[PDB]
Symmetry: C5
């Protein structure tokens, strides 16, 4: 069992695709193992660069294929290098840009924290255990930069497992177990653009929508309700266009549905207050109580949705 020692350098993580759950990683792979004691010119390490590798493998060199289990498609391998020492050591270095995939949950959209995962595994060998994994990730930013979309929390976390494929069953003296190197980087979204542009103005719009009860006659109250509802649909479109596509309702979309509910409740209460014989036009005490209780009730249901969302 040849022991392969891996080291992954991460240069940048970007381009998260919310609907396809795929991000993009760019960096380096350095896999080092020990072979036979070859002889090299000058008794110095020999360097084989990009296209001259493929004429070294044809001669009989052993370069395994380390594939990314979770990549989508095929990584855009740029320059690759292969340095052969005299005592046997071989160091295969390559630069990759891949569009990886994971299982990400965007339900708390503006405040969510994700976990970017790379999984590495030899393509075709099972007695080639990957011996020791290291990540240098110090090139993301200075530290959780305030102009960055994703603040990365702490260093990357590595792991080496023995994945068992129970469908192969070739001879099965433990002949279907592949070593696997999993790395996870914890990231947190930057909730600043989505808090000062999409949540504050919507809070202002809803709180102003409660002012319709402050008017005087029934006709103008019910008239300006329709304008308010038009405002809300315009805002709902504004938000929908900018925000990423998703198959489920985020935190922001629930605020918009709450706005729709608030305006519909305003129309219902306006109509009811107009058509009760006790308070048709006389002694309209219902409207004052409504001004007292409508904001409190909406804030109660807002706290309910917050507590059911954070859970």
């Amino acid at each position: 069992p040849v022991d392969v020692s891996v080291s992954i350098f991460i240069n940048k993580i970007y381009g998260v695709n919310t609907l396809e759950q795929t991000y993009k990683v760019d960096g380096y792979i350095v896999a080092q193992w020990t072979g036979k004691p070859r002889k090299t010119p000058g008794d110095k390490p020999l360097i084989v660069e990009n296209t001259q590798i493929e004429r070294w493998i044809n001669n009989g060199l052993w370069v395994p294929a380390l594939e990314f289990i979770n990549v989508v498609g095929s990584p855009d391998t740029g320059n690759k290098r292969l340095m052969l020492f005299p005592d046997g050591r071989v160091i295969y270095n390559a630069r990759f840009l891949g569009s990886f995939s994971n299982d990400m949950d965007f339900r708390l959209f503006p405040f969510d924290r994700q976990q970017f995962v790379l999984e590495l595994e030899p393509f075709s060998y099972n007695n080639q255990q990957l011996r020791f994994s290291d990540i240098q990730v110090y090139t993301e930013n200075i530290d959780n930069e305030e102009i960055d979309e994703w603040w990365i929390r702490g260093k990357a976390s590595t792991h080496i497992s023995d994945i068992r494929y129970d469908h192969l069953s070739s001879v099965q003296p433990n002949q279907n177990e592949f070593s696997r190197i999993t790395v996870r980087i914890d990231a947190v979204r930057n909730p600043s653009y989505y808090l000062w542009s999409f949540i504050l103005p919507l809070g202002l719009i809803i709180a102003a929508s409660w002012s319709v009860f402050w008017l005087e006659s029934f006709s103008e109250r019910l008239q300006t309700s329709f304008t308010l509802m038009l405002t809300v649909v315009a805002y709902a479109f504004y938000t929908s266009n900018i925000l990423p596509r998703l198959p489920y309702t985020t935190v922001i979309d629930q605020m918009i549905i709450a706005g729709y509910g608030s305006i519909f409740a305003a129309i219902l209460l306006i109509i009811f207050a107009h058509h009760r014989q006790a308070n048709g036009v006389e002694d309209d005490l219902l409207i004052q109580r409504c001004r007292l209780a409508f904001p409190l009730g909406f804030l109660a249901i807002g706290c309910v949705l917050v507590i059911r969302g954070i859970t």
Copy 2:
């Protein structure tokens, strides 16, 4: 007739393109057959990896081309492997990402269920019957995940057919029949984002549009109708932008046309109630009957469109 035994692993299905009817599948192919009893170093299976295959086919190895009948373009084959046993067995393993196509019917758009289909077939041989197909699909999600866009119902369904090409007619002692492996995965859309954001608010808007009859004078009734119609066109745009493109009207678009019809009917009834000499300004009993019958009539036609849509 060499018997090829196939096994397809599905890793992820994503990126459904509604207008082009093409989805994307990523996974593995494992095709295994039996050849001549070759001799290998150490009497162990020999592994040939990516670019060293093409110098084994030139020497005289027999590796058939298994093509996907329904793919669009050419699959983005990543790592490919070829393992040659001593007793004869050959196992060709490859990783593919392809943009497949089918005949999908999105007419019940938010509640539709589709059938993702892969079709596999040897490119150039007719006496190479594909012997036995298997699918392992256990890597989609845990099970019909609530954060997934498509819930996959049950295991995949396989089939092996003998497609006849009646245009070749080379010699025709059954010399134009190709074996074919068809696999179908039943999927169901996740109708949660499209039910709490595009259908509930539109129901609220229409039900509020019926409130225009509750006003007092003709001028203000007909005035606020125009604002309502502006609201509906704004909503129709909001819906159109988010939803996928299609050549026919889904369930949601029929709700919007029903909204247009409802508001136009409201304007017609307002005008008629203003210009009948029996009920010009006197004894306006038509408006009350309208408040009684307009929502019921619209709900009747809504049930009609629902029953004609589910059929």
Copy 3:
């Protein structure tokens, strides 16, 4: 002059790009000719698959380059095959996906019928006449499917011409004439989504815009005109976003300009009726005549634009 016999299979036509006038075709080419009587193992047809062709051409085989004259870029040739019979016959089969181009006229946009054209021609030979063309197109749909964007009318129409290049003039004993295979498929757009969503609601909006004359005082008439014009600009945007880009006005855009004209005429007539001393506020017979004649005049100009559009 070697006679090449062609057969083109069409699997799917999709992705029409209105602004660039390019569509996409996916299918097969089968070109068959007769060469020298070679000797093959077993006296059976020999099959040469994808990458092993290029080491047969280097040995001295004659495989001409059949190019598509009107393709854009280079077709995404997938699997290609080459079957060599003993008596001489050679059959070159290839699978192509190309983004072809034509000269399409989208002026009657929702009701237009186009003609998809493929043009094939040997790249470098003039005494290689293409002998006989066939198209099997039976894989588009069942027949003009109701869930399809383009209904294809009838079978494909083929043609073989002798294109003359008058700029070469190499020796000119008819040494600058290339055979050419042209195929045309007649297609008709599916005018169902564009008729129940973009034309019916606009008809309703315009017909409701004529109701402004039914109000009572001048101030409110001219006030609700502005709201109507806002409605129309919102609709014009809705239509513009969904519809394809074009350098000229389709049928739908003319309806929107007619709507703009109708509302501007309404404002002009409202102002004029307010400021005529005969009918300032007294004996307003002009408004009634306007209600009689405005819809008829607009319908007349609509019939005029229809007759000038269908021509």
Copy 4:
């Protein structure tokens, strides 16, 4: 100095990218020179097609690299051909699709005329003067077609220059001068969609905005001003979405800013007319003079912007 004789065929020019200043050209290159008197089978021209060229250059053939100076990236060279005559002549023919770039000025956007430019130059030789350039461009359209986005004025204009690179200075007996072939095609945009959809409706909207002065009381005048301004912002968005992106204001955007200015001036004049003690509610002669002078003043500033734009 080998004299290379060039001939460029243009098949189609499309896909102008206003923000990146890159268009796309598709066509053919035919470069012909004279070499040594080789010997060919049958004493006839020998044709070398696509992938068999690269095994003729390795043997010692001289095929220079003719690069496009101004291309972006690398042209998508499709089929390439190379015909070797016995007396020496060599004719290299290739089909290219490239995304070229120029310095285009879109300031008069809907009425602008551009100049598509291709620049050709040997990649590495300076004593390889390009002898004679020809363009056949007769395949654009029939002539300046009315369904075309760009009407091409007249034939293409060619030029052969001696570009001097003053930074090389290798030996400098005129050892840093490269021949260059420049071709320019004059094109004119089709100002029909942008004149009947984006300019006429905006003229109507502005001319209707001047009607606000025709109302009666101050409150309703200033009220309907706000609706007008909303109309204009909606239109400004409609225009912005369809039109191409640019770093400077076109002709259309200046009309929208003029609309904003007109409505703001209307509000200022309404307020001033309400708050002058001479004409508070009495003897309102200022409003009539305003109706006389506001359209004339706006038309004056419009003529000013037109004269400063055409310059």
Copy 5:
């Protein structure tokens, strides 16, 4: 230590991607070093062009791999050339189009100035010090052209550093130090389209929004406030659609939030002025003071945001 002398030519910089922080550069690389005194035909420089290089490296030529540290993916290397002099000199010339990345701060969006950076470094050698860097950048434009999106300030600034990789530690007699060539070009955005289209109209809209206090009765004041807020949300959408995506609030977005705050404050003050018993309908001196102080207060907070933004 072979001294490599570099010279980079920049042809165009375009396509800045604000959200991914990647721009695109197109140009040439010229790296020149001195090797052994080879023998060439005719004792003249020998030119090796595109695909014939790879058969010179296989023979034993030494061509290092100069990689761009900060590129994203792999540059689209077009034509490459290699000129071998007799006395030893070798000149490797290549044409590249790459999508580079940097750390750009778009916080002052319309008035920001950026610094485009290229970083070059040998892929695999540490004793190959890069000796002397030069940039010719004279092909951007004439000078800071008024039709250009980015005005480039002054010439490019170069630098040669010794980057130390402290993780290699192979033998460490200074065996982990790579030379690096960094080049920086200072660019300034063109703030003309974003100043006459997105800032001037918004200033006009806000300044007109202050006119609501000039109306007479409470009902109409609070009514036209809602229309104003709808105007602002429409404008906020217009701006959001055109402007680039970002994870933080630019200068323009702060103006929109200020507009939201101004209109909400207007509603609050209208309501308060309606419901104070001292100035319910009598002696409404609060409204006049509000007209005096509201614009001044908003301008004060605007100056505050400007001073906190420029810092």
